[PDB]
Motif scaffolding. Structure first.
Motif, PDB file in Angstrom:
ATOM      1  N   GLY A   1      14.259  19.154   4.938  1.00  0.00           N
ATOM      2  CA  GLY A   1      15.065  18.071   4.261  1.00  0.00           C
ATOM      3  C   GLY A   1      16.332  18.628   3.617  1.00  0.00           C
ATOM      4  O   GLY A   1      16.502  19.856   3.599  1.00  0.00           O
ATOM      5  N   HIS A   2      17.238  17.792   3.074  1.00  0.00           N
ATOM      6  CA  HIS A   2      17.058  16.358   2.747  1.00  0.00           C
ATOM      7  C   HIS A   2      16.353  15.393   3.731  1.00  0.00           C
ATOM      8  O   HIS A   2      16.555  15.373   4.976  1.00  0.00           O
ATOM      9  CB  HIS A   2      18.382  15.706   2.291  1.00  0.00           C
ATOM     10  N   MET A   3      15.545  14.552   3.101  1.00  0.00           N
ATOM     11  CA  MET A   3      14.720  13.618   3.808  1.00  0.00           C
ATOM     12  C   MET A   3      15.554  12.449   4.333  1.00  0.00           C
ATOM     13  O   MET A   3      16.353  11.868   3.626  1.00  0.00           O
ATOM     14  CB  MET A   3      13.585  13.138   2.904  1.00  0.00           C
ATOM     15  N   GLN A   4      15.377  12.150   5.614  1.00  0.00           N
ATOM     16  CA  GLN A   4      15.999  10.990   6.255  1.00  0.00           C
ATOM     17  C   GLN A   4      14.864  10.131   6.793  1.00  0.00           C
ATOM     18  O   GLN A   4      14.507  10.238   8.014  1.00  0.00           O
ATOM     19  CB  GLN A   4      16.892  11.496   7.394  1.00  0.00           C
ATOM     20  N   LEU A   5      14.240   9.353   5.900  1.00  0.00           N
ATOM     21  CA  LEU A   5      13.054   8.576   6.257  1.00  0.00           C
ATOM     22  C   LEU A   5      13.342   7.183   6.846  1.00  0.00           C
ATOM     23  O   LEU A   5      14.258   6.509   6.430  1.00  0.00           O
ATOM     24  CB  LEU A   5      12.063   8.470   5.093  1.00  0.00           C
ATOM     25  N   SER A   6      12.594   6.809   7.843  1.00  0.00           N
ATOM     26  CA  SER A   6      12.579   5.479   8.419  1.00  0.00           C
ATOM     27  C   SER A   6      11.142   5.000   8.501  1.00  0.00           C
ATOM     28  O   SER A   6      10.164   5.786   8.292  1.00  0.00           O
ATOM     29  CB  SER A   6      13.234   5.469   9.832  1.00  0.00           C
ATOM     30  N   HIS A   7      10.949   3.725   8.791  1.00  0.00           N
ATOM     31  CA  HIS A   7       9.622   3.186   8.962  1.00  0.00           C
ATOM     32  C   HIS A   7       9.559   2.191  10.155  1.00  0.00           C
ATOM     33  O   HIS A   7      10.566   1.641  10.595  1.00  0.00           O
ATOM     34  CB  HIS A   7       9.142   2.474   7.681  1.00  0.00           C
ATOM     35  N   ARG A   8       8.330   1.967  10.609  1.00  0.00           N
ATOM     36  CA  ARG A   8       8.030   0.988  11.647  1.00  0.00           C
ATOM     37  C   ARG A   8       6.520   0.717  11.625  1.00  0.00           C
ATOM     38  O   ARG A   8       5.751   1.469  11.036  1.00  0.00           O
ATOM     39  CB  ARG A   8       8.460   1.468  12.998  1.00  0.00           C
ATOM     40  N   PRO A   9       6.077  -0.385  12.233  1.00  0.00           N
ATOM     41  CA  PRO A   9       4.647  -0.642  12.351  1.00  0.00           C
ATOM     42  C   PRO A   9       3.992   0.527  13.095  1.00  0.00           C
ATOM     43  O   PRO A   9       4.555   1.113  14.074  1.00  0.00           O
ATOM     44  CB  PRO A   9       4.568  -1.955  13.134  1.00  0.00           C
ATOM     45  N   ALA A  10       2.782   0.835  12.673  1.00  0.00           N
ATOM     46  CA  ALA A  10       1.955   1.850  13.351  1.00  0.00           C
ATOM     47  C   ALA A  10       1.686   1.393  14.773  1.00  0.00           C
ATOM     48  O   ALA A  10       1.451   0.195  15.028  1.00  0.00           O
ATOM     49  CB  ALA A  10       0.689   2.089  12.568  1.00  0.00           C
ATOM     50  N   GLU A  11       1.572   2.350  15.678  1.00  0.00           N
ATOM     51  CA  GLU A  11       1.329   2.143  17.098  1.00  0.00           C
ATOM     52  C   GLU A  11       0.138   2.931  17.514  1.00  0.00           C
ATOM     53  O   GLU A  11      -0.179   3.943  16.880  1.00  0.00           O
ATOM     54  CB  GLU A  11       2.548   2.578  17.880  1.00  0.00           C
ATOM     55  N   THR A  12      -0.528   2.583  18.613  1.00  0.00           N
ATOM     56  CA  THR A  12      -1.735   3.413  19.045  1.00  0.00           C
ATOM     57  C   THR A  12      -1.461   4.903  19.272  1.00  0.00           C
ATOM     58  O   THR A  12      -2.249   5.801  18.983  1.00  0.00           O
ATOM     59  CB  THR A  12      -2.484   2.752  20.232  1.00  0.00           C
ATOM     60  N   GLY A  13      -0.227   5.173  19.663  1.00  0.00           N
ATOM     61  CA  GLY A  13       0.251   6.523  19.868  1.00  0.00           C
ATOM     62  C   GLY A  13       0.364   7.353  18.653  1.00  0.00           C
ATOM     63  O   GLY A  13       0.380   8.612  18.715  1.00  0.00           O
ATOM     64  N   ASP A  14       0.412   6.731  17.492  1.00  0.00           N
ATOM     65  CA  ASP A  14       0.410   7.440  16.206  1.00  0.00           C
ATOM     66  C   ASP A  14      -0.948   7.768  15.674  1.00  0.00           C
ATOM     67  O   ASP A  14      -1.031   8.583  14.742  1.00  0.00           O
ATOM     68  CB  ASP A  14       1.053   6.564  15.102  1.00  0.00           C
ATOM     69  N   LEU A  15      -2.014   7.227  16.256  1.00  0.00           N
ATOM     70  CA  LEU A  15      -3.353   7.312  15.668  1.00  0.00           C
ATOM     71  C   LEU A  15      -3.839   8.769  15.507  1.00  0.00           C
ATOM     72  O   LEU A  15      -4.418   9.152  14.478  1.00  0.00           O
ATOM     73  CB  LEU A  15      -4.383   6.540  16.504  1.00  0.00           C
ATOM     74  N   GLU A  16      -3.679   9.560  16.566  1.00  0.00           N
ATOM     75  CA  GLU A  16      -4.200  10.947  16.514  1.00  0.00           C
ATOM     76  C   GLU A  16      -3.497  11.716  15.422  1.00  0.00           C
ATOM     77  O   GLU A  16      -4.095  12.470  14.649  1.00  0.00           O
ATOM     78  CB  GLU A  16      -4.068  11.594  17.886  1.00  0.00           C
ATOM     79  N   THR A  17      -2.175  11.520  15.307  1.00  0.00           N
ATOM     80  CA  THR A  17      -1.407  12.189  14.260  1.00  0.00           C
ATOM     81  C   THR A  17      -1.910  11.829  12.883  1.00  0.00           C
ATOM     82  O   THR A  17      -2.231  12.657  12.025  1.00  0.00           O
ATOM     83  CB  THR A  17       0.092  11.923  14.436  1.00  0.00           C
ATOM     84  N   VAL A  18      -2.010  10.531  12.638  1.00  0.00           N
ATOM     85  CA  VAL A  18      -2.386  10.086  11.322  1.00  0.00           C
ATOM     86  C   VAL A  18      -3.821  10.488  10.952  1.00  0.00           C
ATOM     87  O   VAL A  18      -4.143  10.877   9.836  1.00  0.00           O
ATOM     88  CB  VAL A  18      -2.206   8.513  11.234  1.00  0.00           C
ATOM     89  N   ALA A  19      -4.726  10.445  11.947  1.00  0.00           N
ATOM     90  CA  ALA A  19      -6.105  10.803  11.694  1.00  0.00           C
ATOM     91  C   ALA A  19      -6.264  12.322  11.383  1.00  0.00           C
ATOM     92  O   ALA A  19      -7.271  12.702  10.810  1.00  0.00           O
ATOM     93  CB  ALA A  19      -6.962  10.437  12.915  1.00  0.00           C
ATOM     94  N   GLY A  20      -5.217  13.053  11.726  1.00  0.00           N
ATOM     95  CA  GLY A  20      -5.157  14.456  11.333  1.00  0.00           C
ATOM     96  C   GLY A  20      -4.752  14.723   9.939  1.00  0.00           C
ATOM     97  O   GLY A  20      -4.762  15.861   9.485  1.00  0.00           O
ATOM     98  N   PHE A  21      -4.291  13.705   9.211  1.00  0.00           N
ATOM     99  CA  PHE A  21      -3.763  13.940   7.876  1.00  0.00           C
ATOM    100  C   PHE A  21      -4.808  14.406   6.846  1.00  0.00           C
ATOM    101  O   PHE A  21      -4.506  15.328   6.097  1.00  0.00           O
ATOM    102  CB  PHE A  21      -2.964  12.724   7.348  1.00  0.00           C
ATOM    103  N   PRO A  22      -5.979  13.779   6.733  1.00  0.00           N
ATOM    104  CA  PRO A  22      -6.927  14.233   5.673  1.00  0.00           C
ATOM    105  C   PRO A  22      -7.449  15.631   6.025  1.00  0.00           C
ATOM    106  O   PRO A  22      -8.026  15.851   7.085  1.00  0.00           O
ATOM    107  CB  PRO A  22      -8.011  13.210   5.745  1.00  0.00           C
ATOM    108  N   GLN A  23      -7.313  16.486   5.057  1.00  0.00           N
ATOM    109  CA  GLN A  23      -7.664  17.906   5.255  1.00  0.00           C
ATOM    110  C   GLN A  23      -9.018  18.318   4.795  1.00  0.00           C
ATOM    111  O   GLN A  23      -9.473  19.458   5.146  1.00  0.00           O
ATOM    112  CB  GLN A  23      -6.640  18.823   4.540  1.00  0.00           C
ATOM    113  N   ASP A  24      -9.729  17.484   4.092  1.00  0.00           N
ATOM    114  CA  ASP A  24     -11.064  17.793   3.635  1.00  0.00           C
ATOM    115  C   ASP A  24     -11.744  16.527   3.226  1.00  0.00           C
ATOM    116  O   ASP A  24     -11.110  15.448   3.191  1.00  0.00           O
ATOM    117  CB  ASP A  24     -11.077  18.849   2.538  1.00  0.00           C
TER     118      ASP A  24
END
Length: 161
Positions: A1-24
């Motif tokens: 960064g500096h952070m350049q953030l955008s957003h959009r509705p979640a898509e099925t293609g994002d699922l694996e990424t997001v499900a990787g977020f919790p670390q414990d």
């Protein structure tokens, strides 16, 4: 960064990424207390189907945050859940950014006057973040963690505008 953030509705293609977020198991509990460790795309998808407003935050081509609503009541309030941030992007403003996007959605789509967030007692970072963003504690509820231990769920809210 500096952070350049955008957003959009979640898509099925994002699922694996997001499900990787919790670390414990703690992290998964804080963001999805009804989930079972290890987390999986099927568990994440079942949440999304039950909820509304599932949204991702993106920076430099990477999905770094996810959130949704687990309660929504038109003209009244929404309650935010599943707030998750990529482990390489913690403390960089991703949750702050996404909570602001979710506040706008609650106002615009649900005509909400209030956002509710509930945060488990052990999540100090979460409690301090929501405090910085203007949320106030209203109540404390008892809950039980997967080991059957008593925890305190701190129920916060904030008027929207």
């Amino acid at each position: 960064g500096h952070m350049q953030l955008s957003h959009r509705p979640a898509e099925t293609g994002d699922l694996e990424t997001v499900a990787g977020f919790p670390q414990d198991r703690d992290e998964l509990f804080y963001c999805y207390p009804k989930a079972i460790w290890p987390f999986s795309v099927a568990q994440l998808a079942a949440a999304i189907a039950e909820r509304r407003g599932s949204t991702v935050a993106v920076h430099d081509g990477q999905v770094l945050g996810f959130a949704n609503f687990y309660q929504w009541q038109h003209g009244d309030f929404c309650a935010l859940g599943n707030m998750m941030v990529a482990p390489a992007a913690r403390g960089l403003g991703v949750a702050r950014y996404l909570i602001g996007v979710m506040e706008n959605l609650a106002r615009e789509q649900y005509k909400a006057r209030l956002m509710k967030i509930s945060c488990f007692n052990a999540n100090a970072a979460g409690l301090l973040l929501y405090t910085q963003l203007g949320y106030q504690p209203r109540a404390i509820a008892e809950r039980h963690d997967p080991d059957g231990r008593r925890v305190a769920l701190i129920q916060m809210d904030k008027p929207l505008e």
